[PDB]
Amino acid sequence: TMQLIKNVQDLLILTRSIKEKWLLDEKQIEELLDNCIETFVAEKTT
Amino acid sequence: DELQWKSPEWIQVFGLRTENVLDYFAESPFFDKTSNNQVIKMQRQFYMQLEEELMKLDGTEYVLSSVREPDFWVIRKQRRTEIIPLQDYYIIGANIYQSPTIFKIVQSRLMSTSYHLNSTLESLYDLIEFQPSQGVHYK
């Protein structure tokens, strides 16, 4: 009986092994930066 | 085979010696009244020469398979036809020793060993925790 149980655990090990095997543009940017840089320096100042 | 008969007082009314050891064999529960010795005794009422007398009679026999005085002797229960035995009793320390097998003593051994084997097996078997990825671990 004990051997049988151990065998069940072995089946569990196999299943786990299988599971683990399974588991293991440009203008838009230029315009956007143009704004960003402008607003960030606050150079306007007029 | 499991028991030990002693009539420590029986030594006191006599003293414990060879012919005495025979008679004391007769006193203990291990003795049988179905033997020839009882017949001879009863006939007498109504040690070599004894052995000489057993040669004439036909039946179960008990003879002297040792002398170590004043302690040990074997007393052999044998079935005479050529002499077949039966069992062998030892007399040591004013106590009748049961003649326990061969097979029975071995039985005792096996039994004991097996029993505690079982105990250990269960006790330890309760302990482990099993996870499929972890296998069997002891917490």
Swiss-Prot record, chain A:
The keyword Transcription regulation applies. GO terms for biological process: positive regulation of transcription by RNA polymerase II; positive regulation of transcription elongation by RNA polymerase II; positive regulation of transcription initiation by RNA polymerase II; RNA polymerase II preinitiation complex assembly. One of its GO terms (molecular function) is transcription coregulator activity. It comes from Saccharomyces cerevisiae (strain ATCC 204508 / S288c) (Baker's yeast). This is Mediator of RNA polymerase II transcription subunit 22. Belongs to the Mediator complex subunit 22 family. The keyword Acetylation applies. Keywords: Acetylation, Activator, Nucleus, Transcription, Transcription regulation. Present with 2181 molecules/cell in log phase SD medium. Component of the Mediator complex, which is composed of at least 21 subunits that form three structurally distinct submodules. The Mediator head module contains MED6, MED8, MED11, SRB4/MED17, SRB5/MED18, ROX3/MED19, SRB2/MED20 and SRB6/MED22, the middle module contains MED1, MED4, NUT1/MED5, MED7, CSE2/MED9, NUT2/MED10, SRB7/MED21 and SOH1/MED31, and the tail module contains MED2, PGD1/MED3, RGR1/MED14, GAL11/MED15 and SIN4/MED16. The head and the middle modules interact directly with RNA polymerase II, whereas the elongated tail module interacts with gene-specific regulatory proteins. Component of the Mediator complex, a coactivator involved in the regulated transcription of nearly all RNA polymerase II-dependent genes. Mediator functions as a bridge to convey information from gene-specific regulatory proteins to the basal RNA polymerase II transcription machinery. The Mediator complex, having a compact conformation in its free form, is recruited to promoters by direct interactions with regulatory proteins and serves for the assembly of a functional preinitiation complex with RNA polymerase II and the general transcription factors. The chain holds residues 62 to 121 of 121 of the full protein. GO terms for cellular component: core mediator complex; mediator complex; nucleus. It is found in: Nucleus.
UniProtKB/Swiss-Prot annotation, chain B:
It is found in: Nucleus. Component of the Mediator complex, which is composed of at least 21 subunits that form three structurally distinct submodules. The Mediator head module contains MED6, MED8, MED11, SRB4/MED17, SRB5/MED18, ROX3/MED19, SRB2/MED20 and SRB6/MED22, the middle module contains MED1, MED4, NUT1/MED5, MED7, CSE2/MED9, NUT2/MED10, SRB7/MED21 and SOH1/MED31, and the tail module contains MED2, PGD1/MED3, RGR1/MED14, GAL11/MED15 and SIN4/MED16. The head and the middle modules interact directly with RNA polymerase II, whereas the elongated tail module interacts with gene-specific regulatory proteins. Belongs to the Mediator complex subunit 6 family. Present with 4824 molecules/cell in log phase SD medium. Component of the Mediator complex, a coactivator involved in the regulated transcription of nearly all RNA polymerase II-dependent genes. Mediator functions as a bridge to convey information from gene-specific regulatory proteins to the basal RNA polymerase II transcription machinery. The Mediator complex, having a compact conformation in its free form, is recruited to promoters by direct interactions with regulatory proteins and serves for the assembly of a functional preinitiation complex with RNA polymerase II and the general transcription factors. This is Mediator of RNA polymerase II transcription subunit 6.
